[PDB]
């Protein structure tokens, strides 16, 4: 048969607890909102660059 190892019961229970906390909270950070924020930042940066270049090319004083 396939070999067994032994583990103190309470230490396995701790491992279970820690695994389930990752289950609970990791998807509340890792989701589409991270990429969307980076994509949105790059878009506004280019629009700010194009709005600063319009002010730099303007003769107004």
């Amino acid at each position: 048969m396939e070999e067994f190892v032994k583990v103190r019961k309470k230490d396995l229970e701790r491992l279970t607890t820690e695994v389930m906390q990752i289950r609970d909270f990791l998807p509340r950070i890792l989701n589409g909102e991270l990429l969307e924020s980076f994509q949105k930042l790059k878009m506004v940066e280019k629009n700010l660059e194009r709005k600063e270049q319009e002010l730099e090319q303007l003769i107004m004083d």
Binding site: K9, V19, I22, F38
Partner: protein, 37 residues
């Protein structure tokens, strides 16, 4: 002996499945950010 240990293999197998799926989410998210940045 007369006393035997409870078999917690199926609990461990469930944890493996849970973590495998969390690793799929980590890798897909990391690659998404990698592909854009």
């Amino acid at each position: 002996g007369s006393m035997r240990m409870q078999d917690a293999t199926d609990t461990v197998r469930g944890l493996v499945v849970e973590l495998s799926g969390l690793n799929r989410l980590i890798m897909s998210t990391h690659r998404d950010l990698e592909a854009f940045k």
